[PDB]
Amino acid sequence: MRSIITQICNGVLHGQSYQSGSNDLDKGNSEIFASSLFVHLNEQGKEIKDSDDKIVIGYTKDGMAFQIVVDGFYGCERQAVFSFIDNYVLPLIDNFSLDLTRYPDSKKVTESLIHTIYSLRSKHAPLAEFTMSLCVTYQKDEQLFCAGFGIGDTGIAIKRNEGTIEQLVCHTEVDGFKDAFDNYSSANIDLVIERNSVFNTKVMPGDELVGYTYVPPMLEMTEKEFEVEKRIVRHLNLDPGNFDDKDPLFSQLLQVVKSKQKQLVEQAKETGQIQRFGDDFTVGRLVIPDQLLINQLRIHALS
Ligand SMILES: [Cl-]
Ligand SMILES: [Cl-]
Ligand SMILES: [Cl-]
Ligand SMILES: [Cl-]
Ligand SMILES: [Cl-]
Ligand SMILES: [Cl-]
Ligand SMILES: [Cl-]
Ligand SMILES: [Cl-]
Ligand SMILES: [Cl-]
Ligand SMILES: [Cl-]
Ligand SMILES: [Cl-]
Ligand SMILES: [Cl-]
Ligand SMILES: [Cl-]
Ligand SMILES: [Mg+2]
Ligand SMILES: [Mg+2]
């Protein structure tokens, strides 16, 4: 392993939360929070499974930043999922960044990467069934860019230095399907790619990527809905109307989620009825580095 991992979270045990803290190596540019928003009450309004989510954030040996957001389907497979990401996905990231620099069409480079990941999964990790988005930075033409993709229900948003929030990877929903890295979706990888998210964008130091496995659904908006041959596909974005330009997006998302979750739990308790809703909740932050930090990380990777 030549990449530098500054934050990692392999699930969290039921009933617990995880807050990573900052890592001094990348000057507090990366953090993870992991918990569960699952609520299950009896009729008293009294409370009644571990997380399958994983986030990895770090830098290649070339100092390029990456974030990987993963959501495993099934609790009995979670170690197969977490091992697959370590053993097969992470070693691809450095060459992905180099191929984005070296080839003219980022869309072809990313489609090739997605095909490779399904092939490795088939050959080496049949029990790793999971949705995933990822992104990496790369340098071209004396500027910095970020490219990646998501298949399934994880998302990646970006808060730009000037304060604008944009979606890079949307949460995709397809009627009657759960598109994913799994045996079933591998039958038509190119159709799966076409209806999910691939992106390529210029970034500046201080732009802030926020990856997440889940948010309470009233906090998303529908960016686009379209039909495929007949199923409806929905692209769901974090709704920027809940945010402002001052604090980091990671800070504001945790605050807006926690306020919404206290409202949901209060409503659920007061109904005098069984209630069950919510899911595992894992959030990663990655601030795009400046050149000085990129150079420091390259040195650290060598020594
Ligand atoms: Cl590695
Ligand atoms: Cl660590
Ligand atoms: Cl913990
Ligand atoms: Cl399960
Ligand atoms: Cl392969
Ligand atoms: Cl093989
Ligand atoms: Cl095998
Ligand atoms: Cl496996
Ligand atoms: Cl480009
Ligand atoms: Cl397969
Ligand atoms: Cl296909
Ligand atoms: Cl909505
Ligand atoms: Cl810079
Ligand atoms: Mg899920
Ligand atoms: Mg899951």
Author numbering: 37 to 84, 88 to 268, 277 to 350
Sentences from the paper on this structure:
While AMPylases from various pathogenic microorganisms have recently been characterized, the only virulence protein with de-AMPylation activity known to date is the Legionella pneumophila effector SidD which catalyzes AMP removal from the host GTPase Rab1. Here, we present the crystal structure of the de-adenylylation domain of SidD and reveal the catalytic mechanism of Rab1 de-adenylylation. Instead, the catalitic domain of SidD is remarkably similar to that of the metal-dependent protein phosphatases (PPMs), however with distinctive structural features to distinguish AMPylated Rab1 from similarly modified substrates. The finding that SidD is a PPM phosphatase with de-AMPylation activity constitutes a clear example of how L. pneumophila has adapted a common enzymatic fold and mechanism to effectively hydrolyze an unusual substrate.
We identified a proteolytically resistant N-terminal domain (residues 37–350; SidD-NT) that fell within the domain borders of the largest catalytically active domain discovered above and that crystallized readily. The structure of SidD-NT assumed an α/β fold formed by two stacked six-stranded antiparallel β-sheets flanked by α-helices. Pairwise alignment using the DALI server revealed a notable resemblance to metal-dependent protein phosphatases (PPMs), including human PP2Cα and the bacterial PstP which are considered the defining members of this family. In summary, the crystallographic structure of SidD-NT assumes a PPM fold with some conformational rearrangements and the presence of additional subdomains, most of them being grouped around the negatively charged active site. The active site of SidD-NT is located in a negatively charged cleft between the central β-sheets and comprises a relatively well-preserved binuclear metal center. The first metal (M1) is coordinated by four water molecules and residue D110, whereas the second metal (M2) is hexa-coordinated with the classical octahedral geometry formed by four water molecules, D110, and the main chain carbonyl of G111. The M1 position is slightly shifted as compared to other PPMs which can be attributed to the incomplete coordination derived from the absence of a highly conserved aspartic acid residue. Thus, in contrast to other bacterial PPM phosphatases, SidD appears to lack the capacity of binding a third ion at the equivalent M3 position. Quantitative Mg2+ analysis by inductively coupled plasma-optical emission spectrometry (ICP-OES) revealed a stoichiometry of Mg2+ relative to SidD of 1.7 to 1 (data not shown) suggesting that the active site of SidD contains two Mg2+ ions. The structure of the active site revealed the presence of two Mg2+ ions coordinated by D92, D110, D326, the main chain carboxyl of G111, and several water molecules.
